[model samples]
Target: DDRDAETFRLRLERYGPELADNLRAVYGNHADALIGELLEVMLHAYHARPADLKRLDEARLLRPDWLQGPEMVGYVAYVDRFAGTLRGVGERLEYLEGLGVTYLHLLPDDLSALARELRGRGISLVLDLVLNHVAEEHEWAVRATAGEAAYRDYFHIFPDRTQPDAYERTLPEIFPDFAPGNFTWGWVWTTFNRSQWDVNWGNPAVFREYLDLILTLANRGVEVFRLDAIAFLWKRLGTDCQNQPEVHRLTHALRAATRIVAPAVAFKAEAIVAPGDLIHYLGSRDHHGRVSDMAYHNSLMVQLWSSLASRDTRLLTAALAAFPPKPTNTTWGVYVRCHDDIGWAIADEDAARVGLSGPAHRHFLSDFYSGEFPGSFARGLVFQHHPQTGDRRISGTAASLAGLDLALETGDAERVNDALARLLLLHAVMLGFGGVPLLYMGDELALLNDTDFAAVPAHAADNRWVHRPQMDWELVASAQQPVTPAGRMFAGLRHLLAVRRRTPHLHASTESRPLPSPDPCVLLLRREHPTGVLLQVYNFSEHHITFPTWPLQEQLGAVAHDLLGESQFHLGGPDLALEPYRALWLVAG
Candidate 1:
C-alpha cells in the first residue's frame, strides 16, 4: 500500500506538470477547470487498473523502448474475419504466437476478456479510437439533431449554406463517388459520409470526452489505441483542413494525461498523411517525442509499390532521403498493406527531382496496378476515381496486387513463383527497415482477392472490402505442405520474422538510412546497431542484377554473412548477385 502511494505520487510528479502545461497551451483560461477534471479521471483510472496491469505499466515505464524493440511484430485483422468471434481469437493464440506476433490489432464485444487472453499470451491488444467524427446513431449526434445547444456545439452546424459553401472551396471530397460534398443536410460538415458528422475539437469538453474514453479502454487492458483520422481533428478556413498545429497540441495533452493514468497504454496515429506532414504525428517541434508513441509510415508503403511497378529505386531513395528524421523514442507502424485502399501520394516535387512528372507517374502506377498498362503484372481494382484531377486509388489483397491472383488463375508456374518472391520481397523490406512491421491478415497464407465482397449489400459501395477477406482455414491447413503457394509464402515470411527477431540492428531505436545504389533496379539501406552494421539490399527488377560488394564490405565489414541464409554472396569478388525479387540482410561475420 505504501509503495502504491509512492507510485501514484511519482507518476503525478513526473507527468502532471507536463499534462497541465499542455492543457494550458490548448485551453488557455479554461485550463484550470480541465486540469481538475483530468485529475479525477486519472485517479479513477488508477483505481480501476488491475494489479497485473499496474505491473505492466511499471515494466513499460522502465523500458520506454518496448514498442521500438526488434522483437515487436504486429498482426492486424477484423475480429469476425480472423476468427468467428472474440472467443474464437483465444483459440487462435497459438497460431499468432507461431508467427512471433507481439501485437494483435482487432475489435470485439467482450474486448476486456479478449485483451486479457491476448496479454496472457504475450500479445498486446490494439484497438481503434476514431477521433474526428461520430456516427448519427451516437448519443451526441442524436442530441445535436434534437436541437440541444450544448450538444450542437459538439459538431459543426450552421443554419445556412453560406459558411459551408466557403469551406467547400478548400475541402477535398473524401468519398467523391458516393459522398460528393463536404457538407450534407444543408449545413452539417460530414468528412467521410453524411451519417458521420465531424466533431468540433475546439471545445474543451470534447477533449475531456476522448480522454475519458482512452482511460476507460486502457483499464480494459487495451495497450494501444490507433488514433484514427487524427489529422482532421482541427479545422482552418483556407487550408485543406488537416495536419493543423492545434491537432498536435491536443494530442500532446491527451498523451500526457494518459501517461499520468495508464502509462502502459500507447497511441498510434492512423494518419495516412503526406511525407512532409507525416513526421509531425509521431512528434515535432515543442511536442517532440511526447505526442504519440507511433505513427504509420505511409509514404514508405506508397514508395514500395511505386518502385515495384516502375522497377526503379531512384524515386524511393530520393523521397526517403528527403524525409525528416523522427523522434528516436517513437517508432513507425510499417506495413505493406492494410485494410484501407492505397492512394498514390507521390508528391509533385519528389517526382520532379527524380526526372518524372508527378501526375504522369501516379497515372502510370494506377494503370500498372489495375493491370491496364502494357506488361503490368498486378490485378488490382481501381477505387474512388476522380476524373477531374485524374486521381485514382487501388484496392486488392497483397497477393492479387503482387500478381498471384492472375498467375494462379492462368496456372502459370513461372508467374506464381515470381509473385511469391515479390510478396516476400515487400515483407523483407518491411521487417528490416526498422519498425513494428505489420503482417496484415491472410497475407502470410497468400490469400487472393475476395470478389464475393460485392455480394454483400452494405459492403457493395466500398471496394476496400475485397482485401479484407475471411480467414481461409483450408489454406491454413495446406500452408505447411511446401508444394502450394501458401506454404512457400508462409515459410519465407516466417523466416524473415525469425531473422528480424534475433537481429538487434533492426531495432527502431536507431533509424534506417537509405543509401545510394549502383543499380537503379536495387534499393540499399544501412542499419547501424550495437552489434554491428547491417546492409539491406533488395533487387526490385525481374532480371538478375549485380550489386557491388564494395559498399557492404566497406560499411558492414570485409566478411559479411547473408542473414536470410538463402544465398551466399561472393566475398572475394567485387559484385554480389541478386536474383529476381530477392532481398539480402548482410551483416559482418
Candidate 2:
C-alpha cells in the first residue's frame, strides 16, 4: 500500500523546514551533514513504525491538544515494582482504567507489545530519555575507556584538572551524599556519579547519537519521551552549567526530527530547575511552543509541600504567581509525589516577598517532614543533607510524608483521619491544577514508606528507595472495603478523578491563575472557561475557615456548583464554611 509512503511524505513536508532550520541553529556549519544523516534515520524509523501507530499518528496530528484535554489523568510507576513484568502490566489495564488513567509513566518495558496493549485501553506510554550522560558500561563509554579516539570525543575527557577545576567553580554537586564533586578519574565530567560520564554535545556526533536513539524508540511505540537531565546537556564555564541556550536549541532540533518521522511521539522536559529557568524547557521567545510539549511543575510541587508544612499559602501563591506563562500547546506534569526525593525548591526572593527567610523556611520544611520538629505529623526520611549549603531534601511515600504511617503507628483515630484528608487534599489540587496530574504508584491505596529499603544491597545508598516500594497487592485487593484506610483513599481519589473528567473548566489549555488570597491558610486558583469561571479553593490548614460568598456571585453569577461534592451553593446567601483540608471546585451553575 502507498499509505506508508504518503504518510511519510506528508509528515516530512509539514515539518521539514523547521527541522532543517533548527538543525542549522544548533549544529551550524555541520548542519548539512547532520541533516542528511537524520533524514536517513527518519526514513528508517518511519518505514519501521507499526501500522496501528501510524493511524495513531494521524489521529494525534489532527488533535495536537489531545494530551491537554480535561480527561487526561496519569499514573507513574517502576515497571518491576508496579507489576512482576511487562506481561503483568497488560493484565492490569483494568486497574488503570478504574482510576481513569490516560497516561502511564514507567522506567522500563517489554517493547511494542505492552505499548500496543496500553494504547488499546486509551493510555499513552511515557518513558525517560536520558540525554545528559551515559553509564560507564555503555558501549561508547567502554570504547572510550579502551583508548578509542572517536569514542573519547563522545565524553568530556581530559588528561588534566585544568578544565574540570574551572567548571567545578560554578557547577553544583548533583549527588553529594554518595557521588560527591563534579569530576572523577583525573578529569571526566561525571555530574551525577563517576559511573555516569557526561557527554560532549559540542560534538556533532553526540547529537546524532541521541537523535538516532530517540527515533529508534519512537519507532518502537513509546508515545512520550521524558527528556531527563536535559538542562545539563550543554557546558559553559563561569555559569551554573544549566538552562543554557543550546539545551533548548538542541531540544527543538531533536523534537523536529522526531516529528518528521513519528508524529505520534511527544517530548516532556524533565528539568527540575528554578521557576525562572524551568519555563525555558517548555519554550520561551524564539523557541516558544517548539521545545517541549510538557514540563514538570516543580514550583507547584515545592510550593504545595511548603504550604502544607507552614500552614500558610502566601509563599505558595506568590511563588506560583511569579512564574511566566508557558507557550500554547505546552502543559505541566503536576504531581504531589514521585520516585525522587522532595527538594525544598523555595527561592529566597519568593520567600522574602512573603516576609519569611528562605533558608529558614527550607530548613523548617526538611525538619517538619522528617519528624524532627515538635508535633510534626510527617514520617519522612532526610535524603541528602548538604552541610555546606545547609540544603536537605525529604524522602518517603505520600502516605508516610502526610502522617498516615505515623498515625497508624500511634493508633490515633483522629490523626489517621487528618492524615487521609491531607493526602487527598494534595491530590485534589493536583487533579484540578489544569495539567496532567500523575498519581504516584501506591498513593491511591495509602501505601506507607518502605521500611526494608536499606536491606537491598544495591539500593541501600539511596534513600529515595524508601518511597519506591513494591506495590502491595494485598492492600490493593482490600481497596474496596470502606472501613479500611486503603479503601477510603481509593474511593476518595476515584471520586476526584470522576469529577475532573466531567469538568471542562479544568482543561490544561485553560489559564490557571493563582489569585491573592485574603486568608493565608487558603490557596485560591481561578480558571476562566468559555461557559463560566471555575474558582478552586484549597485549605492548607487543619482548621475551619470562612470564604466570603459575595465574591463568587459578583464574578461568576449568583448560582455556583461545587463539582467535588455535587452540591449547589447560593452565593446570594451567607459566607461559605470550609471544613479542615477541604478542596472546593466551584463553577458557575
Candidate 3:
C-alpha cells in the first residue's frame, strides 16, 4: 500500500511543474517549503485515487473550458424521479443528448435505501457528478453505530455533549425553521443529526477516502462534481464552522488532488450562503486556490426573484455591479430554478442599500410567490416557514411562478399569454447573462406545478416536490404544435437556443449592463462584445409600456435589428411600445 505512496511522491518530485506553479502563484517566496508540505499531502491523495480517474484527469486537463461552449446545456433532476435507477438513467442518455444536454446533475442519490431504487448510478456513468451529503441510510453510518472503530472514524463524533454544545453556541443554524438547534445528543456520540451525520474532514483517512471516491467517479466519466453543503464540511469549537479558513484549505487540497488524479472532474461549490461569503468559496489567489472551480450564483438568482416581486431592478443591478470578478479559470453556475427551495440569501448591506429589510422583504417574497399576496398571479407554495423569525422560502415550477398554473386553473387566456411572455423574458436574461445557464427539467415544455407530489408520503411534506414534476412523454411527443402551450414554449426556447449558438456577440466575454427604464415594470439591458451589440428589453407589467429608444443609441449605437424576429427600429428618436410581459433581443449596428 505504501509502495503506491512512494511512487506518487516520486512522480510529484519528477513531474510536478504545474503544482510548483500553483504553489508559487499561491505563495510568493515561500513556495519551496510550502510545495514540499503540500506535495506530501497530495501524494497520499494521489495514491488513493482510482487509476482510471487518473486517465480522466489527463483528458480533462486538455480541455479546461469544456463547459464554456454555446452547446453546453445542463438538466437537473432527482435520479428516482427521472429514472428508476442509475442504470435506468444510462438507458436514457440518448434522450438527454437529443435535447443537446451535455451536463446532467442528479440530486442526493447517495445511499438512502428507501430511495435506494435511486442508487447505484456510479459517478462515471452519468458523466457529471453532484456529491453533496451522504444519507443516514448509508452503510457506513450503520457500521459506525455498531461500534466499529474504522467506520466510526468516518464521521464527526464526539464523546460527550460539551464540544457540540460549545460549538452550537457559535454555529449558524442551517435549518433553523425545521431542525432548530445545531446539536443532536446521541447515545454514543453527540453529532449534528440523529440520523444524518457530518463527515470528519479533520481525519486524513476520511479525506483520502472521499478523494478516492471522487476520483473513481471521475474515471467513470463525471466531468463535474457538485459539492453539496460545502460550507458545513469543516467545524471548529468557537467559530461559525462555515467559510472557515480550514474549509478553504480543505477545498484547495481537494482541488489540488483532483488536478493531480482526476483533472477532468471539476468541483462546483454549492455555497448557498450570503453573496460576500459565497464568493469566498471560489477562493482568491492569495489562498492556495484549492476551492471549487465553479459556484452557484445564488445571489443573482434571488435578485431576479426580488426584481419580479418588487418590480425593481435596483437591488439586482447594485448586487451584480458590486460582484467581485471571478478567477480566470472559474465561472459561476447560473440557473432560473432548481429542485431546492429559493432562499432570500441576498447580502444584508446590499438589501439595506436598496431600502429592503432582510426579514420583511423575504416574508413579502414568500407571500407574493405563493399567491397569498393580493393581485399576485404566481402559484407557488411556502417552504420551511419560520414563525418566530418571520422568514420563509418559496418553491414552485418556473411556469407556476410565471402564473401559468393559475392561468390554467382559472381558464384565463390573457394570463396564459402573460405567463408565457414572462417565462421567455426570464430565460432571455439567463441566456444572455454570463455563465453556463442550467435549465431545470421540464421547464422547456412550460410544465406547471404538479400537485401529484402531495400524494406520495415520502415527498408530500416537501413543497419543493411541486416544482420537480415528472416528464410527460405524451406532451413531449407533441411539443412542435404551436397551438399547444407546451409546444409554443418549447419552440420559442429552441429558436433562442439556435440563435444563441450562432450569435458570436453572445459569447461569455460580452459585458452586461442593466439599462435604466423610466417605468419600474420594465427591465432593459444591453450586451456588447467585439462582434456586435445586443439590447434586451423586458416588460414585467401586465400593461403596455413605452420604453425610450434613446438610451439604446446613447449606450450602444444608432440602428438595430431584432434578433427575436425580423423587425428593424431606429434607436434615437421614438420610444418603442412593448406589450405586456414582452421581451426583445436586438442586434445593433
How far residue 492's Cα lies from its native spot in candidate 2, in Å, is 0.2
lDDT of 1 by residue, 32-63 (tens): 99788878877888888899899999899898
Native-structure RMSD, model 3: 5.6
Model 2 over residues 412-487: C-alpha lDDT tens digits?
9999999999999999999999889988999999899897998998889987999999887777987854879999
CA shift of 192, model 2, Å: 1.8
Model 1 residue 530 CA deviation in Å: 2.5
Where is model 1 poorest over a 10-residue stretch in terms of lDDT? 171-180
Which digits, one per residue and each the tens of the lDDT, describe model 3 over residues 1-589?
7866574655455436654554454345766765565555565556655555555455556767665555566678777777766676666665665666666777653322211221232222222332324556788778887889898777767776766667777766655545456544442222344566677765555655666677655544456777877777777778877777666766676676666655666788877776667768878654423568778888778878778767777777777777776664666778889888888776667778778776677777888997889989888888877656767788899989878889888988888988888788777777767667788888889988888898888888876888887766677778845978898888878877776666666655444667666777777777777676677777666777787777667766778787776678788777878787677778865
Give candidate 3 regions above 4 Å deviation.
1-59, 109-143, 146-151, 173-180, 185-192, 287-290, 356-358, 509-515, 526-530
Clashing pairs in 3: 57-263, 113-116, 124-220, 124-221, 251-290, 252-290
List clashing residue pairs in candidate 2: none
TM-scores, all candidates, are: 0.96, 0.96, 0.84
**lDDT of predicted model 3:** 0.69
